[PDB]
Amino acid sequence: CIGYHANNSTEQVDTIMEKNVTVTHAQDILEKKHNGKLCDLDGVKPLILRDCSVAGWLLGNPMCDEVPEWSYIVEKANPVNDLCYPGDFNDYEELKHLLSRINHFEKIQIIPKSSWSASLGVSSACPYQGKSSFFRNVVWLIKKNSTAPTIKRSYNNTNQEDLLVLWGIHHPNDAAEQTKLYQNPTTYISVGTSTLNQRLVPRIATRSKVNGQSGRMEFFWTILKPNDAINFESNGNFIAPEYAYKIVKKGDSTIMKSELEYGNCNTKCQTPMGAINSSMPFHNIHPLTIGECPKYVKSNRLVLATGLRNS
Amino acid sequence: ICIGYHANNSTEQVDTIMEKNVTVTHAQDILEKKHNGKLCDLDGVKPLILRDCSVAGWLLGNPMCDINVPEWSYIVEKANPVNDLCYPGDFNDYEELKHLLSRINHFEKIQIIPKSSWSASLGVSSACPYQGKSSFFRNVVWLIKKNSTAPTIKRSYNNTNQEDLLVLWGIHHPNDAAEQTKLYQNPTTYISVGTSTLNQRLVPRIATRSKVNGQSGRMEFFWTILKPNDAINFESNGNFIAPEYAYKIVKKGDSTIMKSELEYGNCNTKCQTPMGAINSSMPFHNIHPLTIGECPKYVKSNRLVLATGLRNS
Amino acid sequence: DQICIGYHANNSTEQVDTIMEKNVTVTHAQDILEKKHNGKLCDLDGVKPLILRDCSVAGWLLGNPMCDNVPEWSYIVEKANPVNDLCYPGDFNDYEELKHLLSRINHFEKIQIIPKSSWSLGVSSACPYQGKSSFFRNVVWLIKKNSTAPTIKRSYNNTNQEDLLVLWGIHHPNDAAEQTKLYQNPTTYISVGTSTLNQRLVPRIATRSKVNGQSGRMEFFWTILKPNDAINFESNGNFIAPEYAYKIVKKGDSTIMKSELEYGNCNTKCQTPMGAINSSMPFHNIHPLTIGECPKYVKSNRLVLATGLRNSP
Amino acid sequence: FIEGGWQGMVDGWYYHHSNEQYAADKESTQKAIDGVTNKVNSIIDKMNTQFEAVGREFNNLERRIENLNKKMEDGFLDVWTYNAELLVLMENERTLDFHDSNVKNLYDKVRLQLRDNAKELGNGCFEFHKCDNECMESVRNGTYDYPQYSEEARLKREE
Amino acid sequence: GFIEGGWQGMVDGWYGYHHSNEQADKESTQKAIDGVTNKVNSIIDKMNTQFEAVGREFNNLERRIENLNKKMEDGFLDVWTYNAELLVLMENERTLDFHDSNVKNLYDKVRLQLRDNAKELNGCFHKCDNECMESVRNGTYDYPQYSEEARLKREE
Amino acid sequence: GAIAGFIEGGWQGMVDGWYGYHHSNEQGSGYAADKESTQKAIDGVTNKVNSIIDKMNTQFEAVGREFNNLERRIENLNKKMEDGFLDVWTYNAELLVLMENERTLDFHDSNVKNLYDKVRLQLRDNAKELGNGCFEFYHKCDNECMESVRNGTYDYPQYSEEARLKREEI
Numbered sequence A: 001c002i003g004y005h006a007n008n009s010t011e012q013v014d015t016i017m018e019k020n021v022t023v024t025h026a027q028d029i030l031e032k033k034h035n036g037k038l039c040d041l042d043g044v045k046p047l048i049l050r051d052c053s054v055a056g057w058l059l060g061n062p063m064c065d066e067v068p069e070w071s072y073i074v075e076k077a078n079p080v081n082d083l084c085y086p087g088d089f090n091d092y093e094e095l096k097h098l099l100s101r102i103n104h105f106e107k108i109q110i111i112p113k114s115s116w117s118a119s120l121g122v123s124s125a126c127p128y129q130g131k132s133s134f135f136r137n138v139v140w141l142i143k144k145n146s147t148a149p150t151i152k153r154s155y156n157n158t159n160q161e162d163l164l165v166l167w168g169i170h171h172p173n174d175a176a177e178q179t180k181l182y183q184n185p186t187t188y189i190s191v192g193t194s195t196l197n198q199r200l201v202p203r204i205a206t207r208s209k210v211n212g213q214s215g216r217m218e219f220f221w222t223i224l225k226p227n228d229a230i231n232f233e234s235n236g237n238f239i240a241p242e243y244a245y246k247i248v249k250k251g252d253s254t255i256m257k258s259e260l261e262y263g264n265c266n267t268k269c270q271t272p273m274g275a276i277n278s279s280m281p282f283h284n285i286h287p288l289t290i291g292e293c294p295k296y297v298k299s300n301r302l303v304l305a306t307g308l309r310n311s
Numbered sequence B: 001i002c003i004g005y006h007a008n009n010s011t012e013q014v015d016t017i018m019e020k021n022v023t024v025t026h027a028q029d030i031l032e033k034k035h036n037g038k039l040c041d042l043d044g045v046k047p048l049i050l051r052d053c054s055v056a057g058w059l060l061g062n063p064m065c066d067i068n069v070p071e072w073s074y075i076v077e078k079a080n081p082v083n084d085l086c087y088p089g090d091f092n093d094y095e096e097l098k099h100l101l102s103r104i105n106h107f108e109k110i111q112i113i114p115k116s117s118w119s120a121s122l123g124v125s126s127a128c129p130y131q132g133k134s135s136f137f138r139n140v141v142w143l144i145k146k147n148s149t150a151p152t153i154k155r156s157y158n159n160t161n162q163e164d165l166l167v168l169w170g171i172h173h174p175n176d177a178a179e180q181t182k183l184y185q186n187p188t189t190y191i192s193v194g195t196s197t198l199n200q201r202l203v204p205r206i207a208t209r210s211k212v213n214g215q216s217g218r219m220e221f222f223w224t225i226l227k228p229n230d231a232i233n234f235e236s237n238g239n240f241i242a243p244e245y246a247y248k249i250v251k252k253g254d255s256t257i258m259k260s261e262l263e264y265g266n267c268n269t270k271c272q273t274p275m276g277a278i279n280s281s282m283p284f285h286n287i288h289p290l291t292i293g294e295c296p297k298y299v300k301s302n303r304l305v306l307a308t309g310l311r312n313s
Numbered sequence C: 001d002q003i004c005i006g007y008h009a010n011n012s013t014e015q016v017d018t019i020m021e022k023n024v025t026v027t028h029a030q031d032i033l034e035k036k037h038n039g040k041l042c043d044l045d046g047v048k049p050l051i052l053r054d055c056s057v058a059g060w061l062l063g064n065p066m067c068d069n070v071p072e073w074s075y076i077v078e079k080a081n082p083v084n085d086l087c088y089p090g091d092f093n094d095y096e097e098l099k100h101l102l103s104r105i106n107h108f109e110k111i112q113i114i115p116k117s118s119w120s121l122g123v124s125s126a127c128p129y130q131g132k133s134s135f136f137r138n139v140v141w142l143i144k145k146n147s148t149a150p151t152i153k154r155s156y157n158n159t160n161q162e163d164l165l166v167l168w169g170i171h172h173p174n175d176a177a178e179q180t181k182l183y184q185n186p187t188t189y190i191s192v193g194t195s196t197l198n199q200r201l202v203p204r205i206a207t208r209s210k211v212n213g214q215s216g217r218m219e220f221f222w223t224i225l226k227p228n229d230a231i232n233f234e235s236n237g238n239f240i241a242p243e244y245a246y247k248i249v250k251k252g253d254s255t256i257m258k259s260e261l262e263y264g265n266c267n268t269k270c271q272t273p274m275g276a277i278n279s280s281m282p283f284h285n286i287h288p289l290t291i292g293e294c295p296k297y298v299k300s301n302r303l304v305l306a307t308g309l310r311n312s313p
Numbered sequence D: 001f002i003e004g005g006w007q008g009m010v011d012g013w014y015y016h017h018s019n020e021q022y023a024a025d026k027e028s029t030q031k032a033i034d035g036v037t038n039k040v041n042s043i044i045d046k047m048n049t050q051f052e053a054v055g056r057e058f059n060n061l062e063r064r065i066e067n068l069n070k071k072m073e074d075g076f077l078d079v080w081t082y083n084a085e086l087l088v089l090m091e092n093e094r095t096l097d098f099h100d101s102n103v104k105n106l107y108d109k110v111r112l113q114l115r116d117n118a119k120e121l122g123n124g125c126f127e128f129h130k131c132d133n134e135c136m137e138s139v140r141n142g143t144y145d146y147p148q149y150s151e152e153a154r155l156k157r158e159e
Numbered sequence E: 001g002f003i004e005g006g007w008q009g010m011v012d013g014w015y016g017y018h019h020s021n022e023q024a025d026k027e028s029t030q031k032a033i034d035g036v037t038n039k040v041n042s043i044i045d046k047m048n049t050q051f052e053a054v055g056r057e058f059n060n061l062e063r064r065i066e067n068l069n070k071k072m073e074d075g076f077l078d079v080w081t082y083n084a085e086l087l088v089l090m091e092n093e094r095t096l097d098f099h100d101s102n103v104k105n106l107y108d109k110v111r112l113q114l115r116d117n118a119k120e121l122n123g124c125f126h127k128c129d130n131e132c133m134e135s136v137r138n139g140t141y142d143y144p145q146y147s148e149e150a151r152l153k154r155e156e
Numbered sequence F: 001g002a003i004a005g006f007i008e009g010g011w012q013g014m015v016d017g018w019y020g021y022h023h024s025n026e027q028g029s030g031y032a033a034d035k036e037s038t039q040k041a042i043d044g045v046t047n048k049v050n051s052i053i054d055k056m057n058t059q060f061e062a063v064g065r066e067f068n069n070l071e072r073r074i075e076n077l078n079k080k081m082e083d084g085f086l087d088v089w090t091y092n093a094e095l096l097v098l099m100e101n102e103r104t105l106d107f108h109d110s111n112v113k114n115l116y117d118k119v120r121l122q123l124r125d126n127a128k129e130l131g132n133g134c135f136e137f138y139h140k141c142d143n144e145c146m147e148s149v150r151n152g153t154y155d156y157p158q159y160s161e162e163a164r165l166k167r168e169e170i
Ligand SMILES: *[C@@H]1O[C@H](CO)[C@@H](O[C@@H]2O[C@H](CO)[C@@H](O[C@@H]3O[C@H](CO)[C@@H](O)[C@H](O)[C@@H]3O)[C@H](O)[C@H]2NC(C)=O)[C@H](O)[C@H]1NC(C)=O
Pocket: A208, A209, B158, B159, B160, B229, B230, B231
């Protein structure tokens, strides 16, 4: 006699012409398993913000605590500590994308608080030590001696790397609040760079209180080339920089939204439900992945028939 | 005993990766090619159709544009609507506003601040004639000065409704500096609109322009979505086009703006095409690229016939 | 007497791969993956490409003294880093949209609309022509004449049959001293008019870094003047005015190409920054950035079918 | 070897007997109809359809983004058109070769049934001993008994 | 086809012989394992090309681009699902037909060896011992040896 | 499965076509390829290569990087679909080659056995299945006799008695 193998096999596969078939041995090509925790991407730990936005951690929000390299960034769905003093960030998403993967990141003091001496400024909206405070990395310039003058200061990048500068303007609630803070009625901020040429003006408008504050503060940013110089000149609505960040950019990634927490591991593929360790060509874990991953498919079973049919 | 296979008087032909033109017993085409040439609903939801009006002309109270549809799946406007802004101007973030309104679960116009409380005097132009006698946009008010000066208008609307509320307002850009003093006494003017989200201050731009609808001056419009418990604050010196009506909005899905010249027919479909809807279980079609809804995949081919029976000679 | 049945066999070395068997020797095999290119830029459908050897689109569009006539092109090529961009530093508003619109042009013709004699004129050493400082050729730098800067009001009307592309700019001096020296009035405005366009530009006096020995800036703008529409200029005194325009006819679109190679009198259907492609094949692996009707880009080295039977030599 | 097929056979897709006294095989045809029904059904039902909206929503100063939406609409068209065309050509060959298979598998279902009790003529036909209409239902059933008619074949073969 | 059910008692390999005497074919089994293992690997390895991926980064006033990103993401999920599901359905049948051909070709590899020395009976075929059935497996079986022994018991 | 089967080797001396016969006669020994089967297969494989190339649709695309530094999110979006389409096309083409390479080599296996059965069914007991894909005639057969095995016009009852008698000689 001439025959073929047969065993007690329960795995079932499907044929383009047969609905339901039993088979000796079957192999699955659809990865359905994850480890449920974040890992490193190609051996690089990611930058995780527990309850902090990219703007809250970049600026000096006291709620967030004070790493030179990360493959990607994780922040919660809605971080509870964005801007303690309400406002908006200009080109915030392009800045986030720019910072999603950084090879070298280092905070540097460029123009200390000592050099700003118009006086500083503080609000109860940003509590640091139970007492009213402001952002750690930027300074709020308020008039001193009841006379606001012109503030002219410049910084020149002397480092071998690019550095990122942040600054902003304060939009007071009414015309009276400005004169109290900034004696000049009409006021400007002029920032100068070989690339950048902008001039900011406050916009007095009645607004609703956010975090007990009706005024707003709007931030801007540029990249200062290794031998260029940035020039500030303000009649007195200035939120001036005190710290900067040396940046070495070698690759790009994205910002990841996940409520998970870190586990000491490593992976080639990341998922907000946990990293993946698979060489298979397909998966149905999540669409939002970072790194080299299998292709996302909407299916439950992708099983081939390695052995002959058995009944 | 002989053994043979079937054969019938069939001229239907299919093609094969190694043979072409095979006369076959039975054939089935999986490429959809037929459409009913009329606008149908979407899963039981009617569409918002504008015969000769654009979204900007329909949203603002353009006198020519007509219609309280509380729910729609998508929006149809013809190729070049003839009723946009009766007074020439621009609409800020106009395309993003249209994409938002393409699918709205609930729509209801609300009066926020009436014309009586703004008694500055109301403004009217010949560019927006209602019935030969000149009028203006019916949903917004053109605030022109009264007597000798333009006293600062301070008006705010705290939203107390349960839904998100869409506000529209605008600024008038006069032709020359002489026209502004005539309409708004102050030469330097501003419009400040405040919101927990929005922080805006407008300044008119005086420039010599060509006549459009007999008008050299322009009017630029803006918009925000006022959150349920939020308040919007208006403070203007003149050049102000003030909101009289707003819209409560419930947002539950997205769609697109469709370009088609057809009109509505009492039918229902799962896939819509600017040349007519489709009722197909097929996996492929070749009608039109611009489709809305769950549709077969668009393919450039005329015949996609599988072979179901054995070949015939 | 005997009869034997067999198959062909020849001295063949070409191999193919089977989904179940690897490295199978074959009688005859054909390749369907294009790996060949000729290494020189060509035309697309016989229409030449606009090639700028050492100039950017803005440097060539404006009258850069360092930049060196073509009425029609299919696409544009520029080097990786042109050394003749803007001699006097500055920006170009909507520069990428302007480049994409000029990528494929049906008709292109420089036209004088408002000559130098009608407009006094300014020069800077950042734009050298022949040792002596010069300026952009297609635009005019308006400096104050007789120490007092008055208002300029000049309107040109498009009388040609095609759309024409107007260019203009504004000058941002370093400090308030350089303005008064060049432009007498302390506060300046520039207003440009069109049935579509309404803008009013105010210079930005700010301390900046030297670029080509220049801390000042010049920022350029552009619109498309519809056939019977006219453009109107009104400037306080920071004006960089157009002297030449460009009649354009827009019928197709391509992209801006980056390569260091030059032209040869050849033709092709598909273009590549490493050399054209003459292929009927369905796939290729030359370069991702392609222009034209091309095969699909594939990351592989071999796509060889088996045209003959398996051979054992 | 079976040329032209039987046009007088309408009972189904797949015996013909010239006896002294067409009946299609019910099992081999219905199992074939089940398969081809499953192929067309699996080709259609495996498609995944989602709600999508296409509208050309970008203005004249957003043409670069408009060109990007073009390149992907054009990319997906080229993918589906090439896949749908080649899938038909590949599966149509499989279907017709599958029918050549079912015809031959039935030819061997009868050939191995009656071995040295008949002669392979060459048109898909055999010539038997004698066999009646109730004997050929036994050939169709699969219930054909070899040892009953073995001696009659061994004797009429030496003639 | 003819050989029904297979053998539960065969553990040597996939294709094999059964001998009922008075006292598996690894060649066909080895070629089959190499062919199917190559099919699984190529379905996994020919798609090995993979690069970086990202998520979503568009604000509320950039929802048209967000919808464009949705169009391409949902478009590729539709392509990869339809290809993979059909690739599995198509290659599974070709795998089952591949086993049908191997068994019948192994049936003819024995059928061509002995012609009139035996009677075609279920895929089962003089006296033959345990050393005699090495010749059936190897492909090295001798026909003229037992020719007359069959010619004489055939006419009995 | 005949190529890897009983007809182990391919006749390296046959150039007329792909599939053919070889006759050993006292009058001569030579090859003669079956042009009917070869031309059906030569047209058959060419139909497959052409349909792979012709069913492709190309509609002109201009692929270039036109986004600046403050548009890197859109730049990454274009990258996702550029890289996504390279993955779709590379995988489909590589597997299409492998799948159709097998269907070509098995198309040659089937054409050989169908032609082997074409001769086997034609002459039944007038020859013996040797096992090499060859048949040895029970009767004598000259050069003109072997048109009929090639043509298909072979008369079995002509030489049957010569086969029935030269077989009982034992
Ligand atoms: C927009 O309109 C809403 C409706 O009035 C305003 O919300 C209300 O604000 C007042 C004062 O800020 C709240 O008053 C209080 O209730 C709490 C208990 O819940 C009590 O402790 C306080 O003494 C006071 O009586 C009121 O609850 C609140 N309503 C809601 C629904 O939150 C809102 O302030 C207006 N927005 C602005 C900025 O004008």
